[PDB]
Amino acid sequence: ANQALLLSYAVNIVAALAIIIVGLIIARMISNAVNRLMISRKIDATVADFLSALVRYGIIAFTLIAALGRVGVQTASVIAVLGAAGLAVGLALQGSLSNLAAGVLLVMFRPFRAGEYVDLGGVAGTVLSVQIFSTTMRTADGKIIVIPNGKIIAGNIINFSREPVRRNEFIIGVAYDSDIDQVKQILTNIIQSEDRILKDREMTVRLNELGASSINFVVRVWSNSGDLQNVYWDVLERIKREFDAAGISFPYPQMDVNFKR
Amino acid sequence: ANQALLLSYAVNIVAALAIIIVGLIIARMISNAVNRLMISRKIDATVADFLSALVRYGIIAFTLIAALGRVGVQTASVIAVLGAAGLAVGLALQGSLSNLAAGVLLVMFRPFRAGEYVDLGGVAGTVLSVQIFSTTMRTADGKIIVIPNGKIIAGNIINFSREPVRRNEFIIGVAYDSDIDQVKQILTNIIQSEDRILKDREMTVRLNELGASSINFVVRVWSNSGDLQNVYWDVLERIKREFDAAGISFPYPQMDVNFKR
Amino acid sequence: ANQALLLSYAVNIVAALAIIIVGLIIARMISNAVNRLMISRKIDATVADFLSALVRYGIIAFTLIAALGRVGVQTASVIAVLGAAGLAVGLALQGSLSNLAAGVLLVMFRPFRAGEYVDLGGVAGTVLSVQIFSTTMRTADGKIIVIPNGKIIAGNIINFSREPVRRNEFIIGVAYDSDIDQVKQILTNIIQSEDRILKDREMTVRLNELGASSINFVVRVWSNSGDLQNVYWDVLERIKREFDAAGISFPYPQMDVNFKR
Amino acid sequence: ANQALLLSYAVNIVAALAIIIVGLIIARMISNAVNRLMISRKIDATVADFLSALVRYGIIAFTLIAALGRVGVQTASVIAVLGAAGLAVGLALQGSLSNLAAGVLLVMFRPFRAGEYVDLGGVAGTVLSVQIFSTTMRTADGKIIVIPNGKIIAGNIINFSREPVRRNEFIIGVAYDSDIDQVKQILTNIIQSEDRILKDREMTVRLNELGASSINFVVRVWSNSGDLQNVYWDVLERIKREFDAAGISFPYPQMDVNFKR
Amino acid sequence: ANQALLLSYAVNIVAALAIIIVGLIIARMISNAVNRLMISRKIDATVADFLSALVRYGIIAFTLIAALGRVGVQTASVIAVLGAAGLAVGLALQGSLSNLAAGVLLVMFRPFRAGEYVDLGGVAGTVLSVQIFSTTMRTADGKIIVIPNGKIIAGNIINFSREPVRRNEFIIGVAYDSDIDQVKQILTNIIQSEDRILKDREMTVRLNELGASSINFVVRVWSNSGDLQNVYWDVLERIKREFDAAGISFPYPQMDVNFKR
Amino acid sequence: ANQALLLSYAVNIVAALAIIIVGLIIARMISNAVNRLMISRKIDATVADFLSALVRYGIIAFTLIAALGRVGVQTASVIAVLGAAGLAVGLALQGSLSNLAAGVLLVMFRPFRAGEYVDLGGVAGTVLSVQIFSTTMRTADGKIIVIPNGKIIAGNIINFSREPVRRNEFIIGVAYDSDIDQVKQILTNIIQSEDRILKDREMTVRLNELGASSINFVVRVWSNSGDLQNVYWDVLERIKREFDAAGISFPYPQMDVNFKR
Amino acid sequence: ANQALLLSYAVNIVAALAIIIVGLIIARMISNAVNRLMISRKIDATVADFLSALVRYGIIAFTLIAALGRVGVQTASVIAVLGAAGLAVGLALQGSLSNLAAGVLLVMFRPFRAGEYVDLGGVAGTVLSVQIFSTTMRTADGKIIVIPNGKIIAGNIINFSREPVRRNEFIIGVAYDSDIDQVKQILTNIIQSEDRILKDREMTVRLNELGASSINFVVRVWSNSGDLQNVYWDVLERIKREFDAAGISFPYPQMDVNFKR
Numbered sequence A, B, C, D, E, F, G: 001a002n003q004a005l006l007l008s009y010a011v012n013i014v015a016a017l018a019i020i021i022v023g024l025i026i027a028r029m030i031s032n033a034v035n036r037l038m039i040s041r042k043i044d045a046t047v048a049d050f051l052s053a054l055v056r057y058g059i060i061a062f063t064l065i066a067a068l069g070r071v072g073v074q075t076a077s078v079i080a081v082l083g084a085a086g087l088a089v090g091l092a093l094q095g096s097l098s099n100l101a102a103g104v105l106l107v108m109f110r111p112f113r114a115g116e117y118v119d120l121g122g123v124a125g126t127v128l129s130v131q132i133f134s135t136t137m138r139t140a141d142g143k144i145i146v147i148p149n150g151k152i153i154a155g156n157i158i159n160f161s162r163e164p165v166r167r168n169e170f171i172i173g174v175a176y177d178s179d180i181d182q183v184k185q186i187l188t189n190i191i192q193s194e195d196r197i198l199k200d201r202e203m204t205v206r207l208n209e210l211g212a213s214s215i216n217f218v219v220r221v222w223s224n225s226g227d228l229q230n231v232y233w234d235v236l237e238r239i240k241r242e243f244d245a246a247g248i249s250f251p252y253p254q255m256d257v258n259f260k261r
């Protein structure tokens, strides 16, 4: 009938029972509070139940191994296996968390905004919204593309509508017999007659290369980002009309045939 | 005949025996409960037996090293090797768990739904269902494709049927001798006569480029996503018929041959 | 001649000797049991000996460092190096364990079965069996391909024989002079006369595009997965025969030569 | 009515209550200070609230598990799960932190500066600014590109405007009948007559290869980085004019046709 | 002149000296035993000396930090740095250990054997032997290729000689004017006259496609894996001879030239 | 009024206050010393301030948690979160540290030196200097390329100027009618007449292949690395001149036209 | 004036002072020994100084935190940060250590030797030496390539000179009108007349395919690895000479032109 060690053992076992009971009731309270909060807002039944079950099971495991440790059973192996499971689930959630962090960065720094034409890794379209995990944009064709934010933060972000002024690049191919001065002066007159082409920017009309069947002139003109395509179409049509009127010919693929026998 | 230290040693050895016995019976109870639950639902015999064997062996290892620690043998090396094995199995299950997390995200955010035409990384087809690990979709050809959810969350998710209105893009190539005004007016009449082409959207009929053997006109018209292909086919057939009737010719690959000798 | 501390030291050294002796005999018993079990079933001599040697050496190392700890020599460095070795071997076995987990998933969810034509990442063939580490399939050519299960779970799994009905796609190219109505009516008659083409599915016969040297008609017809190739061959042969009989010509690569000098 | 152990237990419980109360008030003070600092500067409401909530919850968790440890409940499992969560969030923030470190390196070593034409992994444009996470540059076309700093530090950094002098490379293709000496002397005269071509650098005019339809001469001349394109255009135009005047012909694609029947 | 604490300090210092002396002599004994074993078998001098030096230095470090811990100096930092070094060397040896594990798997499951023609990731040749780290195979050209076992376990393993029967695929292109029935009957007679072509397998002779300049027939016949190439050559030669005798012509690349001017 | 435990508590609290005060003053001294050292050399203000702030905050956190531990509050959670942050920052700095280690290796082993023409992963140019993080080289075009040292250590390092002697490879294509003996003897005479071509090395003049329109001779000659390009140009020019003088013709792309109708 | 606890505190502080003094002197001795050893052999000044500084700073940090622990300040945070730094530097040195391990494996197993022609991942050349970190080989062109050993162990190692006998593969294309028997007998006579072609190996002369403009014969002959190229050149030249003498023609690209208008 020991009085010191037996009393210590009784204190330990009563403390372990109190620990497990308090852990059970605290897990119940936490689960009830989480269920109340998930009821207070929009949530999915299956995911909410899975999350509450995982939280409750985690708390129950914590209090059970705490009670075992208070009793005197070593729980280092259980802690190691729990750490392994936590590392596995962290590696599993690495992709989702990286997308979330990238979305936070995109919201903060604002590389692009809603209604702003962009090019995120080869796909281009008007941005509609930037969610936490992925942005959604509508292409010029009309289809909706959802791009994860991690793949947006990684790689370049071309922004077409950030700069108010953009440049067109015409590549006109005329025959070798065509007069260089006449071609240059016709193209210069066409560029000057246009009103939506900015005159304070560079207006290049130069002979760019000597091709296989034609000499390729290059025309580079700057215009406001909203008139770029219309200017391109109008200038191309006027180039064709004036070249046809002036006798300048666009050559077909040339070929020299050395006839034998 | 010591009374304090010998009593402590006896308490320790009896506690170790109690720990190992209780561990054995608790492992038996847990295995029986898991077997009962797996019987209560659909399960595979081999996988169920492997899982129960792994769980029982884990519990037995836990209680054995707990008994060794209570006796006095250090078990830190066993715990380290068990942690290494847990890390190895976590890295092994990383892919499956990532697929599971991606499936949960796809169910929650609903980037696509059943019966919705999509394009998940180059493969396009009607989605049939979204499971926990992988979705299955039927392509237009009729074959079934199973895509892991991780590879769906990673990369773009093109959704063709999300937007009710989509755009067609015709590229008509006519000869250089063809009249630009006549071609444009014929294409405009063809577009206007169509009823499934939305008139409140942009209807582009412009000269897009000067090709090697033809001048390429571009026609862009918007229509409801359900009439897109039929509108494309009807407009193409009418374009050919009206161009043949009006004398506009679609040129063959042109070539200028400079005859020598 | 101390009686307390000297007795404690004697107890510690005797306990260490008992620990090392019991570790040796337990390692011998475990090795004998493992050897008996490996004898009871099919096993390879070299791999079995290597595994038994590794297990015995691990147990011997465990009991040796346990004896050192009981004596009083700190073994934290040995435990750290053992953990490093365990992590290295876990990273080494990561690929094999990932293949094993993927094989378990493939057996459970059954994306494909034995005797089912599939396409696992670009290679297509009839599945023969699904082992734990890798499946083996015979291609239509007759060669056997062994694909690791991890590379099967990763990436798409196209299943040709899952859906009973599949679609053919004929691309017929006829000359520009050919009558569109006559071509369409001939193709429609050929499709209707076929009995293995399902009549309740869509039967598309439309002008698909205006090519460089021909107008490309598209024919899409559905049939049971077992008659797909035979239907394709029969329809193609009948298309050629009827086009030759009706005067419709398949054009050779066209070219316009503008003769000069 | 014990006086030693009961007093120790009372001290422990009072200390735990003091620990939790002081943790609560210190968390409140830290949150108030962080809120004051975020008010003192520009910040976003949602991100600021999320960061303050995370910091406060972390401090509350710390003080709660400290109080539990002071009471006597083992918290090793909670610490292991917290470490797993910290590792997961560290892996999530790995990309952003790598971009930040790369930005620091780019600011320090200055591989490129604002207003300096560069080529960062295939995209070339004038650098506008180098932020902490990503630099922004305007291409010659006029579009703005935002490149993450990690992808800039990785891979080559071509700098066009670092070196004051750059080299042009003309590839002139003349007919096989053309006189090599005459072609070389004409090209040499054209190069010598140019004033923006540096005369102290190498001026190569050599026959580079015998092509399929022409003999390709190579002209390499050095000029200041600001006159490179203008020199290229002027030299090309003068080359064409002088070759046309001197009778040297640029051959069309040659072909020998062996006529049969 | 304390008798308890001073005696404890003397015991600790004498124990530390004994620990370091025993560690030195045990390191000497282990090094001598390892040197004797390496002498007993084939070994390289430099690698053997490096391995023995590493083992001896590891044991010396272990016993030195054990002596420091017994003295009373904390060695947790040394243990942490040693763990970091162990993790670094484990990551370094990850590739070699993965190759070793893959070699063990290849030996066990036997995906291929010596003298068996295979295709390991694009390279094909007769397997000579499978070592622990890499297999060596001789290609049909005669060069020896050594493939690491990890890269063999990863990716497909095409085995040409596993299946006794393989299929040939002839693609014959004949002119559009050729009689389909005559071509099919000639090919069928050629296939039937062959003795090494299995008659119980499928023997396909069908019109496969309508090409640009020819109609492509397809012939598929099965034969034993040892007669595949000889059957291919003999059937091809007989096809050419019989088509030349029967008047069937293999067309040259066709072209329609629309002469103008 | 306890005298033992109360005195112990007073000692602990006074020790904690001393620890925090000494930590504060030591942090101040370390920050002052680091600031003095950064003043003594070139440094950037922002980076220096950030580094000093990080060091001071780290020391303050260390001494604060040390004071908490001395008081009696468990700090294992704080240590775990600090370890997670350290691992995150280590993964962030992994790329920079790998570049630094690669730079150290490049400086030590000297795979290339300043002023030595190299080819580091597809980009070739004269090396200017090798810094700690990245080398900079000037290409033959004149642009400066900065390559991170990690990407240099990874992958091949082609060194053009390491070997004093290099080989040219001429591919001459002559008509099928050309005399093989005459072509070989002319090429041999041209090679022999050259003085910068080493005569003790192999001088190959052989018929390499039968091409589609020409028979391709191969000429391989060795020369000093400084005369390689000049020898190539001179030999090519002499080859053309002597072939034109001797009647050997370089054929244009040949084509046999079988005229029909 | 306590006699027990005060004496213990004095012992602890004197022990801490002794620990720090002995750590300082041991660091000095180790640095002096390392400097002496680095003087005794070839070393670089900057790298040697950096390594000695790192070693001395590590030892100083170790002894400082040991003294702090002996005093009573908890150093777990310092140990955690030191472990994080060690992990970061281990990840940094992962590439270099992997190259070192691969070099050790290459030296041991000897996949290739000095003076042995190989192909290490697409680059082929004669191996000069195999260092610890990277091998260096001279290509047939004459340039020196340094390949890291890790990238050599990874991927295939084609060894051209391991097998004494290698096979040539001639692809001769003759006109469709050519006699198959005559072509085969001429090629067989040419192969038989050669003395460096092994007669005990297979000597294939078969019709390989029916090409677009020619029938392609295949000739496969084995020869010693040293005579392979000379045999190829001699056989090719004799093939051309005998085909020209016998009237067999090598056809130019054929084309059937269907003339219209």
Ligand SMILES: CCCCCCCCCCCCO[C@@H]1O[C@H](CO)[C@@H](O[C@H]2O[C@H](CO)[C@@H](O)[C@H](O)[C@H]2O)[C@H](O)[C@H]1O
Residues within 6 Å of the ligand: A069, A071, A072, A073, A074, A075, A076, A077, A079, A080, A081, A083, A084, A087, B083, B084, B086, B087, D074, D076
């Ligand atoms: C795969 C990933 C792995 C990540 C790393 C995992 C490391 C896990 C380390 C676990 C350490 C547990 O730490 C230790 O646990 C045991 C319970 O088991 C606690 O308790 C133990 O010792 C105390 C000492 O007073 C005893 O009263 C108690 O009966 C006993 O169980 C210890 O007080 C604690 O220090």
Ligand SMILES: CCCCCCCCCCCCO[C@@H]1O[C@H](CO)[C@@H](O[C@H]2O[C@H](CO)[C@@H](O)[C@H](O)[C@H]2O)[C@H](O)[C@H]1O
Residues within 6 Å of the ligand: A074, A076, B069, B071, B072, B073, B074, B075, B076, B077, B079, B080, B081, B083, B084, B087, C082, C083, C084, C086, C087
């Ligand atoms: C490869 C991945 C590695 C991940 C990290 C792994 C770290 C492993 C650390 C294991 C720590 C074990 O922690 C320690 O274990 C021993 C048993 O061995 C326990 O027990 C030990 O010390 C107690 C002290 O009272 C003694 O009564 C007991 O006889 C003895 O065995 C300790 O109370 C516990 O603190």
Ligand SMILES: CCCCCCCCCCCCO[C@@H]1O[C@H](CO)[C@@H](O[C@H]2O[C@H](CO)[C@@H](O)[C@H](O)[C@H]2O)[C@H](O)[C@H]1O
Residues within 6 Å of the ligand: B076, C069, C071, C072, C073, C074, C075, C076, C077, C079, C080, C081, C083, C084, C087, E082, E083, E084, E086, E087
């Ligand atoms: C590279 C991967 C690294 C992964 C992480 C590795 C962490 C390794 C941590 C090892 C911790 C060992 O934990 C500790 O070990 C020593 C033996 O060395 C044990 O024993 C030590 O302290 C006890 C205290 O009573 C003494 O009686 C004993 O003489 C002494 O050796 C401790 O009871 C245990 O707590």
Ligand SMILES: CCCCCCCCCCCCO[C@@H]1O[C@H](CO)[C@@H](O[C@H]2O[C@H](CO)[C@@H](O)[C@H](O)[C@H]2O)[C@H](O)[C@H]1O
Residues within 6 Å of the ligand: A082, A083, A084, A086, A087, D069, D071, D072, D073, D074, D075, D076, D077, D079, D080, D081, D083, D084, D087, F074, F076, F080
């Ligand atoms: C997934 C990533 C994992 C990374 C690695 C994680 C390792 C986690 C190891 C946790 C170690 C905790 O360390 C241990 O914690 C317990 C509380 O639980 C503390 O406290 C415990 O033992 C002390 C001993 O005096 C008791 O008074 C106290 O009642 C008890 O709770 C110990 O003093 C401390 O040593």
Ligand SMILES: CCCCCCCCCCCCO[C@@H]1O[C@H](CO)[C@@H](O[C@H]2O[C@H](CO)[C@@H](O)[C@H](O)[C@H]2O)[C@H](O)[C@H]1O
Residues within 6 Å of the ligand: C074, C076, E069, E071, E072, E073, E074, E075, E076, E077, E079, E080, E081, E083, E084, E087, G082, G083, G084, G086, G087
């Ligand atoms: C970068 C990778 C990092 C991987 C993880 C590394 C974790 C390293 C943890 C080391 C833990 C060491 O564990 C601890 O070590 C010290 C020595 O330093 C031992 O010893 C210490 O405490 C004992 C307590 O009785 C004292 O007698 C002794 O004087 C003192 O040095 C402890 O008994 C042991 O518990």
Ligand SMILES: CCCCCCCCCCCCO[C@@H]1O[C@H](CO)[C@@H](O[C@H]2O[C@H](CO)[C@@H](O)[C@H](O)[C@H]2O)[C@H](O)[C@H]1O
Residues within 6 Å of the ligand: D082, D083, D084, D086, D087, F069, F071, F072, F073, F074, F075, F076, F077, F079, F080, F081, F083, F084, F087, G074, G076, G080
């Ligand atoms: C995400 C990456 C994670 C990497 C791994 C991280 C592992 C972290 C393990 C921390 C271990 C801390 O180790 C433990 O800390 C507590 C403080 O908290 C110290 O102190 C604790 O126990 C001592 C025991 O005498 C008490 O006096 C003190 O009041 C108490 O706070 C312990 O003496 C020390 O052993």
